Paper text:
GBS strains express either one of two SRR proteins, Srr1 or Srr2. We now report that both Srr1 and Srr2 bind to a specific tandem repeat region of fibrinogen Aα chain. As was previously predicted from sequence and functional analyses, Srr1-BR and Srr2-BR each adopt an overall fold that resembles the binding regions of “microbial surface components recognizing adhesive matrix molecules” (MSCRAMMs), including the well characterized ClfA, ClfB, SdrG, and the likely MSCRAMM UafA. Like other MSCRAMMs, Srr1-BR and Srr2-BR contain two domains, termed N2 and N3, with each adopting the DE variation of the Ig fold.
To assess whether Srr1 and Srr2 could support a DLL mechanism of ligand binding, we determined the crystal structures of S. agalactiae Srr1-BR and Srr2-BR at resolutions of 1.65 and 3.65 Å, respectively. An unusual feature of the Srr2-BR structure, not observed in Srr1-BR or in any previous structures of MSCRAMMs, is the conformation of the C terminus of the N3 domain. In contrast to other structurally characterized DLL proteins, the latch region in S. agalactiae Srr2-BR adopted a distinct conformation in the absence of ligand. Examination of the structures of the S. agalactiae Srr1 and Srr2 binding regions suggests how Srr2 might have greater affinity for the host ligand. In Srr2, the C-terminal latch of N3 appears to be pre-ordered in a conformation that might best be called “open, but ajar” that is poised to close over host ligand quickly. Although the cysteine cross-linking studies suggest that both Srr1 and Srr2 C termini are able to close even in the absence of ligand, the pre-ordered conformation of the C terminus in Srr2 would almost certainly require less time to do so. This would theoretically increase the kon and reduce the koff, and it could be numerically reflected as improved ligand affinity. To reveal whether the latch domain of Srr2-BR was important for binding, we generated a variant of the protein (Srr2-BRΔlatch), in which the terminal 13 residues of this domain were deleted.
Numbering used by the authors: 230 to 545
């Protein structure tokens, strides 16, 4: 009665994948944010309370970089009912569903899942040609090859070849926090400008809900060679300069940094920022003069105004 794993006890199970939501077929771009799509139907006799089943995922499929386990939409009855809750574990990269009472009470129980997955920005660090994505279960599996790109930085042949890129990586929706990483001097070029060079992080639209006011910025220093497209890497193994360039929890409500007149060929900076967050946000980082007359910037929005994470009810 206590419950147990029942993946064996599964019939007519058909699982698949695809894209569609992607810019242009055969390619998945983060700086834009597209996804995969697990088609999954199945039938079963009877199941008790705790009974569960896995969905083995490849070492590169992520559901939500946030935390170390994300809850995924449950399976439902034709009449939208609690049928089986789901939960993705980042360490064992597999999704798990634990049935409920409804599941026990019935016999001709048929379930279906249309879950949208993404590539993992921690493993698929840089850009790839035809990556392999696979979702497995009992006997049936589900392959699909897609490319994985990250829009280039932004550059103007000014002050030597000023370059910048940025991106919202994790979005702790529950706790309401984001991680807005940014890279300075991506191309990695020796760049100078009398009157100085600066970097400023701020929310771009009158109605962003960043609240940098209560954010935590942390800066690391490195070399363009060993840096990633996704910006998600092992920072300890690189110099921490935060303390000397800027302090977290800025009163102004935006960070501004004076790098000085020169940034060396090798000198590149990773700026991780963790802020609060509300309905929607869109913010950028710059690399310009005290004015932004001459400079460069990179924005990255998120909205999802009142959505679109928990998209209850969806059929295609």
């Amino acid at each position: 009665v206590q419950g147990q794993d029942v993946t064996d006890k599964l019939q007519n199970l058909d699982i698949k994948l695809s894209g569609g939501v992607q810019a242009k077929a055969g390619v998945i771009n983060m700086d834009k944010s597209e996804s995969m799509h697990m088609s999954l139907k199945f039938t079963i006799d009877s199941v008790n309370r705790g009974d569960t089943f896995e969905i083995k995922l490849s070492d590169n499929i992520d559901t939500n970089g946030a935390s170390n386990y994300s809850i995924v939409e449950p399976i439902k009855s034709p009449t939208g009912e609690v049928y089986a809750t789901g939960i993705y574990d980042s360490q064992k990269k597999s999704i798990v569903y634990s049935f409920t009472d409804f599941a026990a009470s019935k016999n001709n129980i048929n379930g279906i899942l249309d879950i949208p997955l993404w590539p993992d920005d921690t493993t698929v660090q840089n850009t790839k040609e035809d990556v392999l994505f696979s979702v497995k279960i009992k006997d049936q599996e589900a392959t699909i090859k897609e490319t994985v790109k990250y829009d280039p930085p932004v550059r103007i042949d000014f002050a030597g070849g000023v370059s910048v890129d940025s991106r919202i990586t994790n979005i702790d929706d529950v706790g309401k926090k984001m991680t807005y990483i940014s890279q300075i001097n991506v191309d990695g070029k020796s760049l100078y400008n009398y009157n100085g060079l600066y970097t400023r992080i701020y929310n771009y639209s009158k109605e962003s809900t960043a609240d940098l006011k209560n954010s935590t910025i942390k800066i690391y220093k490195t070399t363009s060679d060993n840096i990633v497209e996704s910006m998600v890497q092992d920072y300890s193994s690189m110099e921490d300069v935060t303390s000397k360039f800027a302090n977290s929890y800025p009163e102004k409500g935006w960070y501004d940094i004076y790098w000085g007149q020169f940034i060396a060929s090798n000198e590149t900076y990773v700026i991780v920022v963790e802020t609060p967050f509300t309905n929607a946000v869109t913010l950028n980082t710059t690399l310009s003069d005290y004015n932004e007359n001459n400079g460069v910037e990179h924005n990255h929005t998120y909205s999802s105004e009142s959505g679109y994470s928990d998209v209850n009810a969806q059929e295609r």
